[PDB]
Amino acid sequence: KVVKFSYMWTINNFSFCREEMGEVIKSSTFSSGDKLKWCLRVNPKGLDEESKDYLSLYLLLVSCPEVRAKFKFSILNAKGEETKAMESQRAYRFVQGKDWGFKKFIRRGFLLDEANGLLPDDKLTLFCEVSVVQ
């Protein structure tokens, strides 16, 4: 009894400068079809010492009218393929305002490397796949 859906978030004018980027940016909401609204939450720069060289990615339950779900995050490169995918082993319990994710999703050093093609035209494209347990 699983409902699986996804959302592609393109972040424009990506910058490594906090005073320009903001410490926290969220995507617009999305769902499977569905009253449950979800959104992605990114910390361009990890908000703690252990994740300071990383970009943090979380899945947030915006509105809930109490829910368990698995998720997977991946970056879409310049040619549309999935890379640096990170998925939760199990499902986690979400309630309104609660998030789950990886504070060390990807190295801020990796994004800079143009060789990876992770920031085409200063655009970061993230793809999230959510599986809600019924």
């Binding site: 986690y92 998030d99 789950w100 994710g101």
Partner: peptide
């Protein structure tokens, strides 16, 4: 990998 949350509980 193991997921984490920005909040406790």
């Amino acid at each position: 990998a193991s997921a984490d949350s920005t909040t406790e509980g």
